[PDB]
Amino acid sequence: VSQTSIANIIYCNSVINRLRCDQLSFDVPDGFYSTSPIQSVELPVSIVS
Amino acid sequence: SDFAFNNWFLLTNTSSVVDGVVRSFQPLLLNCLWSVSGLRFTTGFVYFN
Amino acid sequence: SDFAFNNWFLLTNTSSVVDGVVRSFQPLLLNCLWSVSGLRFTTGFVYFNGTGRGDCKGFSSDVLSDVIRYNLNFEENLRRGTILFKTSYGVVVFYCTNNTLVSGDANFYCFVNTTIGNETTSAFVGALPKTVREFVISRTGHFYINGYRYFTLGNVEAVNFNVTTAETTDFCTVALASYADVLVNVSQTSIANIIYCNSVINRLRCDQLSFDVPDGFYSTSPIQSVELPVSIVSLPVYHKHTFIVLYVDFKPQSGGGKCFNCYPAGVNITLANFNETKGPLCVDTSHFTTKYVAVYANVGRWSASINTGNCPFSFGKVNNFVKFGSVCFSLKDIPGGCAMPIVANWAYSKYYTIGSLYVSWSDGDGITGVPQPVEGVSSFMNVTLDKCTKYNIYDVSGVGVIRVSNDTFLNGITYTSTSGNLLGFKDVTKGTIYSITPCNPPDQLVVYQQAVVGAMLSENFTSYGFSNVVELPKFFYASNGTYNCTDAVLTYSSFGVCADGSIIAVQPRNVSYDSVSAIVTANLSIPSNWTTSVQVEYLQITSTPIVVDCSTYVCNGNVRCVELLKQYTSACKTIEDALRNSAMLESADVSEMLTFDKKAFTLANVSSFGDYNLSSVIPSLPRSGSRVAGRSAIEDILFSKLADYKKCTKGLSIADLACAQYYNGIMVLPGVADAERMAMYTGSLIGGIALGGLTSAASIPFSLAIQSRLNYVALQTDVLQENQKILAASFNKAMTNIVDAFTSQALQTVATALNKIQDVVNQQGNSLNHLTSQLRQNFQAISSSIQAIYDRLDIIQADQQVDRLITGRLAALNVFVSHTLTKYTEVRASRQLAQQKVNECVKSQSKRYGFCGNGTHIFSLVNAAPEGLVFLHTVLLPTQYKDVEAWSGLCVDGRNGYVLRQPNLALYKEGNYYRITSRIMFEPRIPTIADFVQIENCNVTFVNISRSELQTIVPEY
Amino acid sequence: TIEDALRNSAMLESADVSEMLTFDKKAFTLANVSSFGDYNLSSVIPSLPRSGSRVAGRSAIEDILFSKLADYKKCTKGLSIADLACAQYYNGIMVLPGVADAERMAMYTGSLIGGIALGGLTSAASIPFSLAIQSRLNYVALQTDVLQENQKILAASFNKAMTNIVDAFTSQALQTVATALNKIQDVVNQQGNSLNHLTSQLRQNFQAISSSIQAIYDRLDIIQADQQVDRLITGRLAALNVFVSHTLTKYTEVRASRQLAQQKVNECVKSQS
Amino acid sequence: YASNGTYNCTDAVLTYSSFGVCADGSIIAVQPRNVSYDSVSAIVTANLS
Numbered sequence A: 001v002s003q004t005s006i007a008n009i010i011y012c013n014s015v016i017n018r019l020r021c022d023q024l025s026f027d028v029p030d031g032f033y034s035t036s037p038i039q040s041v042e043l044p045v046s047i048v049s
Numbered sequence B: 001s002d003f004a005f006n007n008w009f010l011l012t013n014t015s016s017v018v019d020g021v022v023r024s025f026q027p028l029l030l031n032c033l034w035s036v037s038g039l040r041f042t043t044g045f046v047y048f049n
Numbered sequence C: 001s002d003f004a005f006n007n008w009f010l011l012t013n014t015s016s017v018v019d020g021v022v023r024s025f026q027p028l029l030l031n032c033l034w035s036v037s038g039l040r041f042t043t044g045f046v047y048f049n050g051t052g053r054g055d056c057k058g059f060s061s062d063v064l065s066d067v068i069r070y071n072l073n074f075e076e077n078l079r080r081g082t083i084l085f086k087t088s089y090g091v092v093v094f095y096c097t098n099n100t101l102v103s104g105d106a107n108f109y110c111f112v113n114t115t116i117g118n119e120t121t122s123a124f125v126g127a128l129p130k131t132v133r134e135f136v137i138s139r140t141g142h143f144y145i146n147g148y149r150y151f152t153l154g155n156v157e158a159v160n161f162n163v164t165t166a167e168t169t170d171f172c173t174v175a176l177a178s179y180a181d182v183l184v185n186v187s188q189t190s191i192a193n194i195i196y197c198n199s200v201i202n203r204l205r206c207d208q209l210s211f212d213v214p215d216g217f218y219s220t221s222p223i224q225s226v227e228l229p230v231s232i233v234s235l236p237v238y239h240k241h242t243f244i245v246l247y248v249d250f251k252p253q254s255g256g257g258k259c260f261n262c263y264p265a266g267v268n269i270t271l272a273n274f275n276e277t278k279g280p281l282c283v284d285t286s287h288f289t290t291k292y293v294a295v296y297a298n299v300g301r302w303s304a305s306i307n308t309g310n311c312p313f314s315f316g317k318v319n320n321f322v323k324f325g326s327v328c329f330s331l332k333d334i335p336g337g338c339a340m341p342i343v344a345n346w347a348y349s350k351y352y353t354i355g356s357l358y359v360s361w362s363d364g365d366g367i368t369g370v371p372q373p374v375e376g377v378s379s380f381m382n383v384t385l386d387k388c389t390k391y392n393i394y395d396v397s398g399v400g401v402i403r404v405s406n407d408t409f410l411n412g413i414t415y416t417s418t419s420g421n422l423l424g425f426k427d428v429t430k431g432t433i434y435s436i437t438p439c440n441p442p443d444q445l446v447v448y449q450q451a452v453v454g455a456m457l458s459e460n461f462t463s464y465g466f467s468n469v470v471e472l473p474k475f476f477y478a479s480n481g482t483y484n485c486t487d488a489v490l491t492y493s494s495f496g497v498c499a500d501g502s503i504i505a506v507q508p509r510n511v512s513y514d515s516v517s518a519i520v521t522a523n524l525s526i527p528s529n530w531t532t533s534v535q536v537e538y539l540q541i542t543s544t545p546i547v548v549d550c551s552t553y554v555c556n557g558n559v560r561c562v563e564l565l566k567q568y569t570s571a572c573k574t575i576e577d578a579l580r581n582s583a584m585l586e587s588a589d590v591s592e593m594l595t596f597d598k599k600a601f602t603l604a605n606v607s608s609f610g611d612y613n614l615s616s617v618i619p620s621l622p623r624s625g626s627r628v629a630g631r632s633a634i635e636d637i638l639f640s641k642l643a644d645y646k647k648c649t650k651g652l653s654i655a656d657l658a659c660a661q662y663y664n665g666i667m668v669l670p671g672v673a674d675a676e677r678m679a680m681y682t683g684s685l686i687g688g689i690a691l692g693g694l695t696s697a698a699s700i701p702f703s704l705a706i707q708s709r710l711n712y713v714a715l716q717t718d719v720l721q722e723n724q725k726i727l728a729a730s731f732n733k734a735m736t737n738i739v740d741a742f743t744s745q746a747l748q749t750v751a752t753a754l755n756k757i758q759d760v761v762n763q764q765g766n767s768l769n770h771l772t773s774q775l776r777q778n779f780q781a782i783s784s785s786i787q788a789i790y791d792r793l794d795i796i797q798a799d800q801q802v803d804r805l806i807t808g809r810l811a812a813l814n815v816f817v818s819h820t821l822t823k824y825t826e827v828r829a830s831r832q833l834a835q836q837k838v839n840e841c842v843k844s845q846s847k848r849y850g851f852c853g854n855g856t857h858i859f860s861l862v863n864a865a866p867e868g869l870v871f872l873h874t875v876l877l878p879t880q881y882k883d884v885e886a887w888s889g890l891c892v893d894g895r896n897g898y899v900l901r902q903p904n905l906a907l908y909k910e911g912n913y914y915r916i917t918s919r920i921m922f923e924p925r926i927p928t929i930a931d932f933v934q935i936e937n938c939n940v941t942f943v944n945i946s947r948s949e950l951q952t953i954v955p956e957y
Numbered sequence D: 001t002i003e004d005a006l007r008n009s010a011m012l013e014s015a016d017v018s019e020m021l022t023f024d025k026k027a028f029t030l031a032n033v034s035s036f037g038d039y040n041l042s043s044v045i046p047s048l049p050r051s052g053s054r055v056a057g058r059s060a061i062e063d064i065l066f067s068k069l070a071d072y073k074k075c076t077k078g079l080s081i082a083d084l085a086c087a088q089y090y091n092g093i094m095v096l097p098g099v100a101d102a103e104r105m106a107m108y109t110g111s112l113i114g115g116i117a118l119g120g121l122t123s124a125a126s127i128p129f130s131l132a133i134q135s136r137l138n139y140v141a142l143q144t145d146v147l148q149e150n151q152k153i154l155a156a157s158f159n160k161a162m163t164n165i166v167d168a169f170t171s172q173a174l175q176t177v178a179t180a181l182n183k184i185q186d187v188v189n190q191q192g193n194s195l196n197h198l199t200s201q202l203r204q205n206f207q208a209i210s211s212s213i214q215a216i217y218d219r220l221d222i223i224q225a226d227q228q229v230d231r232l233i234t235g236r237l238a239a240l241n242v243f244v245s246h247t248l249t250k251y252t253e254v255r256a257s258r259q260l261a262q263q264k265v266n267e268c269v270k271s272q273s
Numbered sequence E: 001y002a003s004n005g006t007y008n009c010t011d012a013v014l015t016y017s018s019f020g021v022c023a024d025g026s027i028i029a030v031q032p033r034n035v036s037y038d039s040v041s042a043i044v045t046a047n048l049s
């Protein structure tokens, strides 16, 4: 955003784009980063008492 | 990419930021490309369809 | 001691620890030794009494036993048994039938049926253990099987054990016991041994959460634990009383036949103060004594009483010196006010409350509850003087001892310290003032060889069994031994302690040094042949980097938590960005510092050296593997004296401690100083000593090399080199001595290095040992578990109590990062110094005093060590000095006087002829004319020689 | 962990500072001012015992500096009201006696000062101070004059400069002295206000009804008293951990200054650089 | 370690103390800095440079 007006956007779909958006920047310098890919669906429920 | 979107605006309940980089939730699905070409007074009723 | 107690177990309500050291409260009183020998089915009823048919052994007091423990020593077979519990309210029995039928035999079904009075009830066992090795019971009624507690019965008057065993060797024990405070060592969740916390030394040891605390200094506070006289003081004002009394008269028709909690004849409970208008009754006279009042006629086993509510002040304690601005106690409800409930118990089995005592209050200094019922025109100010006491002085409470003082101080009435604790007060009556010393100031004690010896105190008294209390400046000191001042086995800057505890004043290190040798044309002494020595130093070089995943650490896998965090990515990005950039920076530096020479690495073969036999330093050959190098002897000795995640998502083992940390999100990177290139670097440096500039690449004998290095200090001028052959015998002996010291000041130096290494390792570990503990505590939330928080609440009020967790966690994380940066920025200095001296001492002899050793420096070895290096500075120390008679200059028969071209030389008259020697070694050199220089003005103070005898000294003509 | 860290660090640093302080009885006796000469460095030399069995006494520049800048034995007994320091003991802080005691400190300083007039001689006797300066000069270059005007001229400027600077205590050199004095008062303030900040925090109660634990017990029954108690200690432990983590950061940094000091005292003090 | 490229060990475009990575993602063990230095030249009455 420049002068409160939009300039461009980046969809957070791909893994690389995900990391880039997480970086709050563009063009992260070549290096090492950490990530956690997580399942987002219902899972079987188990109980023991 | 490269869309000017000069008219296009952000949405904020609170005070707007200026000239910053921000990730957020926006209603940006392309959906129907135009859906209003040649708009006239009898625009009809569209109900999230 | 030495009891196996394999069957014996711990007791824990919560999850059991495994393989740890823990001090806790356990029921471990020996009481009756056995009390169950030859146990048969008719075991009888024992009720927390000495009435146990067994050999108590006479160490048993037989007063009372808090708990009953059953230890079973039978083969792993099922034998019919029943358990009977007798309580005044009811008799409960436990039965199990092997057969499928509910009656079964007198698929396994167990039924425990409890009958109260004439009513019989049936209960469900549910889960049945495959095998039970131990049984625990208590008077409170807690029931423990194999440590965990399944359920707790209300009360047990007596216990009867219906166990029948055909086997003559039926079982090992069924005993009684009582609580105590002990420490335990647990391996694989199973006990190994314990330590009773009775003696003072044992008390300190248990406090140390360890055994065998190292000899040193510790602090202790011995405290009286009995009732003390109570003293009160208030401003004298003629007491005008107010009595608030309440008449609860529960009086039901027994309640055991139908219901006790049904509030029968429960009705009127009231206090005379109610008004027909019923305006809230707030007292006006400041002095009032609240009392519970009389109670209704009480029948067996049941009662009613008041309970603490939600107000700040508990009713009944209000009279104990409290303040209030407006009581306004009311029987009905009061808007915006606290309320308390009275409940009734039928043998502690039915709880039924009653709306009671609406109270609201303003804060103030006028109204004050007084315990003493009598209030009137009287004189009282009880004040015990010189004993430990409680006290209330002008609405301030505490404990201590009162001392009379002499200080006018008529300005006011109370004096308080900066901390907020009052120091002294003045009587209203006369003007005297009294101080308030605390009862038990901390005392400093000393321990050595796992026993206490000596003690620093404050009072001129022998508190312990010590036979002497030597008064000393700034403190007193007790000891149990005579003063013989033989030596010190411990030391502090001011003083050291003797073996028996005698105190001694330290005499600093007797040493001696040298200085410039001013030419004075008189007698002087030069050092003769030296002896070798070795000094050891240690330098921190690197820090094990750590990395953290923000979102794992705080979110812990909850998607909703992740989404609430999503708006804070502006914040926590800085943390991991800083840690990562700092790690890669320092690793780049340490990788830039490590050079290598293949030409010289091969030279590290011990055959190249000679008599020195520095076997330990040289790197080991590969152990039939394709590895460039192996750690040296001093290396694995040091490591000895001091995991893969690949196995932490797979495998069949339970996760390890390190493995757990990964789950939480901390992640320790592999260390920068890996052994391969570390050993190559060290070996190359070591091989750079025997390599000198040659047209060929071959080596030369090590002996010649030392001579060359010596030449640097001065021109060694001897043809038959005794030093080369003598110093090695001292050198290799010193080395064997010091490696033995690993496995004479040099010894204390080695002790200092070792202490420093264990220091840095502890300093590194307890950082994250402190970090990972803080998430176990919830700052303000109902519970730590985010998942549980979501379970306990709907969408509107769950996130609201969630976010205050992360608001604290982020702060703790920012603290951690801000302290890690402060570790790196400081270790960088030590890195600078290390690189600055390794390339100086290791490569080229220094001419700087005190940088490479106590005296003149010859060469230095280097090896690796945890996150650091270690040096071996070989030096030279003068064995003896040779005296000699000199001349500060020369005068020819002509006016011209001659002097020397550089100062470091000095003439002397060895015999008839004159010899000029070095100032730093006794090596002598021939005189010649080229070594002199001319100055016109003759000083008479020099040698006086003409041109004739000049030809006798130097062949001029 | 708190007290274990503080104790181990204290004994470590005290062992180091005790390892650094050497002594020479041969040279300590040489500190007699009669040995020097026109220089009259009266201020530096250590004072003789004041009719007491004390090895040494502080020098003039020493007590001037201290001037410009208790026993617990009397804190459980006596008739006086407790002093501020005394109060701290009651609370539980405890300042250990300083490592640099005056006796061995003065012996060390005096021995170093006496190492200047001592040169290698067959006998143990001294030589005139004048000859010594000439030898040190030779190091820079072969002083070649027979009638040594420097020895006699520079002393008149030297003793005058010294009187000027001791007056400055009681020209860039002046600003240098001002800087040192400012640095000393800086470190002393920096040391005091640490525990002056510590001991104040227990006067405030983080969330409890009142600070006084005894009062808290008076105002409540067993079930709801410990519950409002523990949140006191939950804060107090945090404050304590902050204090220890900042003390370790003071030690680990002062160690560098110690290194530099030992590195230059043995260089400049002993042999011209 | 996963990678999408073959191992040819040409060079390293990124590095960490234990190891470095190739341009295509192939992993490589670092060889420390080949250097050489000198030392005292003991008089030995023989060939030297």
Ligand SMILES: *[C@@H]1O[C@H](CO)[C@@H](O[C@@H]2O[C@H](CO)[C@@H](O[C@@H]3O[C@H](CO[C@H]4O[C@H](CO)[C@@H](O)[C@H](O)[C@@H]4O[C@H]4O[C@H](CO)[C@@H](O)[C@H](O)[C@@H]4O)[C@@H](O)[C@H](O[C@H]4O[C@H](CO)[C@@H](O)[C@H](O)[C@@H]4O[C@H]4O[C@H](CO)[C@@H](O)[C@H](O)[C@@H]4O)[C@@H]3O)[C@H](O)[C@H]2NC(C)=O)[C@H](O)[C@H]1NC(C)=O
Binding pocket: B011, B012, B013, B014, B025
């Ligand atoms: C100004 O302030 C206003 C204040 O009102 C803001 O308006 C609110 O904005 C929030 C955030 O966008 C919005 O919450 C979202 O609502 C939409 C619509 O909800 C309905 O759609 C879901 C399917 O997505 C259906 O299940 C159902 O019809 C939803 O309605 C229900 O909401 C909850 C949660 O689903 C239900 O339990 C209730 O029963 C109720 O019927 C959602 O699209 C969005 O859902 C996302 O989060 C939920 C909860 O975690 C999750 O279950 C959804 O799957 C989804 O999460 C992700 O899934 C999609 C799948 O396509 C994936 O692509 C993304 O990763 C998704 O994030 C969420 O519930 C809220 O309703 C608004 N307020 C109201 C009252 O309308 C406004 O935005 C502010 N403007 C700014 C920014 O200034």
Ligand SMILES: *[C@@H]1O[C@H](CO)[C@@H](O[C@@H]2O[C@H](CO)[C@@H](O[C@@H]3O[C@H](CO[C@H]4O[C@H](CO)[C@@H](O)[C@H](O)[C@@H]4O[C@H]4O[C@H](CO)[C@@H](O)[C@H](O)[C@@H]4O)[C@@H](O)[C@H](O[C@H]4O[C@H](CO)[C@@H](O)[C@H](O)[C@@H]4O[C@H]4O[C@H](CO)[C@@H](O)[C@H](O)[C@@H]4O)[C@@H]3O)[C@H](O)[C@H]2NC(C)=O)[C@H](O)[C@H]1NC(C)=O
Binding pocket: C011, C012, C013, C014, C025, C140, C179
């Ligand atoms: C699993 O979770 C359960 C939860 O219930 C745990 O069970 C509780 O364990 C605690 C701690 O052991 C236990 O508290 C202790 O109770 C026993 C028995 O109390 C009765 O004995 C005392 C004499 O000691 C009598 O005065 C009176 O009969 C006691 O009963 C009364 O309790 C309070 C306090 O005394 C009274 O005010 C009430 O009126 C009530 O009638 C006690 O032995 C123990 O007492 C110790 O502390 C108190 C309070 O400070 C002190 O006054 C005692 O003198 C004693 O302190 C020290 O004195 C002895 C002297 O020999 C000295 O040797 C030690 O230094 C002592 O520490 C305390 O009251 C609690 O009752 C249990 N719960 C119930 C409901 O029974 C179980 O432990 C958990 N298991 C684990 C570890 O996983």
Ligand SMILES: *[C@@H]1O[C@H](CO)[C@@H](O[C@@H]2O[C@H](CO)[C@@H](O[C@@H]3O[C@H](CO)[C@@H](O)[C@H](O)[C@@H]3O)[C@H](O)[C@H]2NC(C)=O)[C@H](O)[C@H]1NC(C)=O
Binding pocket: A001, A002, A007, A008, A026
């Ligand atoms: C974020 O948004 C800002 C706003 O558009 C971007 O900055 C703008 O970037 C353009 C180029 O992308 C700049 O234009 C260049 O400016 C120079 C100097 O005037 C001109 O000579 C060039 O020909 C070109 O026009 C422009 O100055 C700059 N303006 C501002 C206000 O920043 C920025 O690049 C965007 N960043 C990302 C990552 O999207």
Ligand SMILES: *[C@@H]1O[C@H](CO)[C@@H](O[C@@H]2O[C@H](CO)[C@@H](O[C@@H]3O[C@H](CO)[C@@H](O)[C@H](O)[C@@H]3O)[C@H](O)[C@H]2NC(C)=O)[C@H](O)[C@H]1NC(C)=O
Binding pocket: C185, C186, C187, C192, C193, C211
């Ligand atoms: C705390 O409890 C553990 C568990 O018993 C103690 O460790 C065990 O200590 C024994 C000796 O006391 C070790 O036995 C020795 O092991 C070696 C190597 O196997 C063997 O050669 C010896 O002959 C002897 O058996 C045993 O290995 C060790 N086991 C474990 C799991 O630690 C520990 O000493 C106890 N500490 C205290 C202070 O009580």
Ligand SMILES: *[C@@H]1O[C@H](CO)[C@@H](O[C@@H]2O[C@H](CO)[C@@H](O[C@@H]3O[C@H](CO)[C@@H](O)[C@H](O)[C@@H]3O)[C@H](O)[C@H]2NC(C)=O)[C@H](O)[C@H]1NC(C)=O
Binding pocket: C510, C511, C512, C513, C514, C744, C745, C854, C855, C877
């Ligand atoms: C470097 O440090 C070492 C250790 O501090 C010094 O070693 C020691 O040198 C002193 C002389 O200052 C020796 O003292 C004397 O020993 C004789 C014979 O026992 C005794 O009769 C004298 O009265 C005096 O005590 C001491 O023996 C010696 N110790 C060792 C273990 O070597 C060394 O002198 C220091 N070098 C310099 C230049 O300061």
Ligand SMILES: *[C@@H]1O[C@H](CO)[C@@H](O[C@@H]2O[C@H](CO)[C@@H](O[C@@H]3O[C@H](CO)[C@@H](O)[C@H](O)[C@@H]3O)[C@H](O)[C@H]2NC(C)=O)[C@H](O)[C@H]1NC(C)=O
Binding pocket: E034, E035, E036, E037, E038
């Ligand atoms: C100071 O550091 C620089 C850079 O680390 C060193 O420069 C390099 O010196 C090495 C010798 O140790 C040279 O190595 C050789 O080069 C020849 C010709 O390419 C090759 O045939 C050999 O097998 C070997 O690789 C290297 O070329 C040279 N590099 C540069 C950029 O100058 C310098 O030697 C270091 N000085 C000292 C005293 O360590």
Ligand SMILES: *[C@@H]1O[C@H](CO)[C@@H](O[C@@H]2O[C@H](CO)[C@@H](O)[C@H](O)[C@H]2NC(C)=O)[C@H](O)[C@H]1NC(C)=O
Binding pocket: C465, C466, C467, C480
């Ligand atoms: C300290 O000194 C006391 C006496 O000076 C020693 O006491 C004896 O200790 C045994 C063992 O408890 C008792 O049976 C004697 O009655 C004690 N004698 C007296 C006179 O009290 C004690 O053992 C000494 N302890 C140490 C560690 O030195």
Ligand SMILES: *[C@@H]1O[C@H](CO)[C@@H](O)[C@H](O)[C@H]1NC(C)=O
Binding pocket: B041, B042, B043, B044
């Ligand atoms: C829109 O409003 C105008 C009047 O403002 C009206 O004439 C017209 O009919 C309206 N459109 C529709 C589709 O009803």
Ligand SMILES: *[C@@H]1O[C@H](CO)[C@@H](O)[C@H](O)[C@H]1NC(C)=O
Binding pocket: B047, B048, B049
């Ligand atoms: C939109 O389509 C859905 C699905 O056919 C239908 O239920 C709905 O009625 C449509 N919209 C309107 C306004 O009818």
Ligand SMILES: *[C@@H]1O[C@H](CO)[C@@H](O)[C@H](O)[C@H]1NC(C)=O
Binding pocket: C047, C048, C049, C158
């Ligand atoms: C245990 O002994 C006490 C004291 O004599 C006694 O009151 C009690 O009745 C005895 N136990 C039983 C079950 O009677």
Ligand SMILES: *[C@@H]1O[C@H](CO)[C@@H](O)[C@H](O)[C@H]1NC(C)=O
Binding pocket: C093, C094, C095, C096, C111, C112, C113, C120, C121, C122
């Ligand atoms: C269970 O209770 C019933 C009814 O009181 C009784 O008949 C039966 O014997 C009990 N079971 C036992 C004691 O195992």
Ligand SMILES: *[C@@H]1O[C@H](CO)[C@@H](O)[C@H](O)[C@H]1NC(C)=O
Binding pocket: C073, C074, C169, C171, C172, C173
């Ligand atoms: C355990 O039981 C066996 C069974 O024969 C017995 O011989 C032995 O004495 C018992 N050991 C004990 C009670 O410690």
Ligand SMILES: *[C@@H]1O[C@H](CO)[C@@H](O)[C@H](O)[C@H]1NC(C)=O
Binding pocket: C247, C249, C267, C268, C269, C270, C271, C272
């Ligand atoms: C309260 O109730 C009891 C029994 O119901 C009765 O004896 C008494 O008179 C009542 N009133 C007062 C003031 O106690």
Ligand SMILES: *[C@@H]1O[C@H](CO)[C@@H](O)[C@H](O)[C@H]1NC(C)=O
Binding pocket: C230, C382
């Ligand atoms: C206060 O002093 C009087 C006079 O000795 C005494 O009777 C009374 O019991 C004392 N009170 C207490 C609580 O000791």
Ligand SMILES: *[C@@H]1O[C@H](CO)[C@@H](O)[C@H](O)[C@H]1NC(C)=O
Binding pocket: C460
């Ligand atoms: C200390 O105790 C000793 C023991 O005899 C006694 O002689 C001395 O007077 C006491 N001193 C003080 C100040 O109490």
Ligand SMILES: *[C@@H]1O[C@H](CO)[C@@H](O)[C@H](O)[C@H]1NC(C)=O
Binding pocket: C484, C485, C486
């Ligand atoms: C120890 O004391 C005895 C008797 O007082 C004395 O003869 C001996 O010299 C002393 N020895 C030491 C090493 O203090």
